[PDB]
Design a protein around this ligand. Sequence first.
Ligand SMILES: Brc1ccc(CN2CCCNCC2)cc1
Length: 209
Amino acid sequence: EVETFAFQAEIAQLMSLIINTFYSNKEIFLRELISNSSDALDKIRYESLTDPSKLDSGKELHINLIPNKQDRTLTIVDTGIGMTKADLINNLGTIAKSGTKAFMEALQAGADISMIGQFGVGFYSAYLVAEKVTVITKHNDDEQYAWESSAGGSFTVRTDTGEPMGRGTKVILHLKEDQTEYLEERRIKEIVKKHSQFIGYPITLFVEK
Ligand SMILES: Brc1ccc(CN2CCCNCC2)cc1
């Protein structure tokens, strides 16, 4: 049972700008997604300070980067607070409408796409490199859900029958054909060292057969 939703017009505009603007510095997508994971881990850590049972769904707080060249996917896994179904539908827990408004004003006023994270909509930088994005998520207060979009104005939400996650969020980037450098170990290491050196959680880059 799959529910299909329309993006708000402002978010559809944001994604089309990200997909269509000529902008070579695409590597910042990974910084933005790792930053989102760190924010989600901060949230469940804070909640656990007054209620230790919040970590009954998993005590480890970490970020995993999983490249798969056969599937041409890069997956970013975190054990943060996750998202409810309502969060997913509401622009994956962001204030994307007001954030997009501020971002596009800054772009005409000198800014570039790399500053997207300052406007709270860094998730959508995934479409710099991905033709399709799948988000699997589990929040303590809801069931496991799968969000998916290839842009084009719509996204889907369904209950996830796949591998149970415990708690957190999995962002699966189905990479564009010409963006497979982001599956190479040395390229991922370079980006993480350049942009994510002070993230306060272990980042593990998985290797392949
Ligand atoms: Br790939 C990769 C590259 C470098 C690190 C070093 N890290 C920085 C991120 C946060 N943990 C402290 C140490 C990790 C993964």
